[PDB]
Amino acid sequence: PSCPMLCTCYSSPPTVSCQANNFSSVPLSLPPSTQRLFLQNNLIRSLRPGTFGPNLLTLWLFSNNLSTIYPGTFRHLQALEELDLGDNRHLRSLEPDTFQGLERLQSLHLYRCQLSSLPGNIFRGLVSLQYLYLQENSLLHLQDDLFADLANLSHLFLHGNRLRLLTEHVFRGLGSLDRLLLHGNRLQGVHRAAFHGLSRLTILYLFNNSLASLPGEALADLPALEFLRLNANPWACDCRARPLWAWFQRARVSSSDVTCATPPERQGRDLRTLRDTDFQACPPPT
Numbered sequence: 212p213s214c215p216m217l218c219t220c221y222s223s224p225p226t227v228s229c230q231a232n233n234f235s236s237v238p239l240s241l242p243p244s245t246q247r248l249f250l251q252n253n254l255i256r257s258l259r260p261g262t263f264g265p266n267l268l269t270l271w272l273f274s275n276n277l278s279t280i281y282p283g284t285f286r287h288l289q290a291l292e293e294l295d296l297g298d299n300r301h302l303r304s305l306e307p308d309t310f311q312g313l314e315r316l317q318s319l320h321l322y323r324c325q326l327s328s329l330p331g332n333i334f335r336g337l338v339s340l341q342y343l344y345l346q347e348n349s350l351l352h353l354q355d356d357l358f359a360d361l362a363n364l365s366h367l368f369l370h371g372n373r374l375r376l377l378t379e380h381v382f383r384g385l386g387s388l389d390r391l392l393l394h395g396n397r398l399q400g401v402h403r404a405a406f407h408g409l410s411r412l413t414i415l416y417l418f419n420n421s422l423a424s425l426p427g428e429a430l431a432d433l434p435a436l437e438f439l440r441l442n443a444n445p446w447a448c449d450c451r452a453r454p455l456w457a458w459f460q461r462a463r464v465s466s467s468d469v470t471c472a473t474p475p476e477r478q479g480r481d482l483r484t485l486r487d488t489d490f491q492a493c494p495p496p497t
């Protein structure tokens with residue numbers, strides 16, 4: 212029973228290389244000892260339970276043609292550490308239990324799959340997860356608590372989606388988060404307490420969104436921040452700018468520029484060029 216048809220197998224570590232065959236399905240006869248399974252660059256259309264063996268540590272399925280993953284498919288891959296499903300442009304939705312079983316998973320790639328939404332409980336129990344790549348789908352919203360079990364998540368990539376708002380508990384439970392990329396969305400509001408608990412976050416990209424302002428509490432909630440990108444937003448340099456401006460007076464972080472789009476008499480200037488006296492007619496903190 213030695214190697215799937217058209218693939219190459221290696222014994223240390225136990226590896227099955229099946230890439231670039233235009234397969235329409237996962238090959239049969241995978242040796243049960245297989246630890247690494249390379250199926251990228253095929254045309255596989257669906258996955259089912261009974262397909263993958265329990266020893267896999269690494270599974271690459273990117274650039275296939277996945278449109279369906281049937282319930283139970285990953286359920287017995289207790290040992291799996293990396294799962295790459297990126298670049299399956301017709302995949303479109305995932306059932307709530309897709310990743311049930313995957314408690315040792317450390318990185319999960321789901322970029323460019325045309326996801327518009329996710330089930331609110333799809334990432335529950337992924338306690339080992341460290342990297343989660345969701346960039347360049349079409350995600351419209353992220354529910355409160357969508358990442359709540361991910362106490363080890365270090366990088367979360369959410370750029371290039373269609374997000375408009377970050378709600379109060381969207382990032383609840385992300386106490387290890389180090390980098391959060393949100394650029395290239397259409398974000399218009401961030402809840403005051405959206406970054407609560409992100410005490411280890413050092414990098415935050417928000418550039419290229421529709422932000423006119425950000426609350427003071429959100430920046431205050433990032434005590435470890437080191438690099439913040441804010442450019443290519445329509446920043447309002449009026450009373451709304453003051454909590455951000457005040458945070459900039461005290462913060463030690465690298466930053467992009469923060470260019471005012473309004474009012475016209477300040478358009479083009481950097482938000483940090485404003486003076487305390489530009490804010491003297493502003494109602495006191497509310």
Ligand SMILES: *[C@@H]1O[C@H](CO)[C@@H](O[C@@H]2O[C@H](CO)[C@@H](O)[C@H](O)[C@H]2NC(C)=O)[C@H](O)[C@H]1NC(C)=O
Pocket residue numbers: 254256276278301
């Ligand atoms: C990639 O999978 C997609 C999505 O299932 C396939 O597009 C479909 O093609 C079939 C037959 O041509 C039609 O029933 C559908 O109208 C198409 N669906 C969608 C959503 O476009 C496409 O056939 C697949 N291509 C390959 C090369 O596997």
Ligand SMILES: *[C@@H]1O[C@H](CO)[C@@H](O)[C@H](O)[C@H]1NC(C)=O
Pocket residue numbers: 231232233
């Ligand atoms: C697979 O399919 C495409 C036809 O779309 C072809 O160009 C390519 O050479 C095929 N690749 C392999 C590796 O057999």
Ligand SMILES: *[C@@H]1O[C@H](CO)[C@@H](O)[C@H](O)[C@H]1NC(C)=O
Pocket residue numbers: 371372394395396397419443
């Ligand atoms: C900004 O984001 C959109 C995705 O929302 C993208 O199409 C475009 O390439 C980016 N624009 C700039 C000016 O970088």
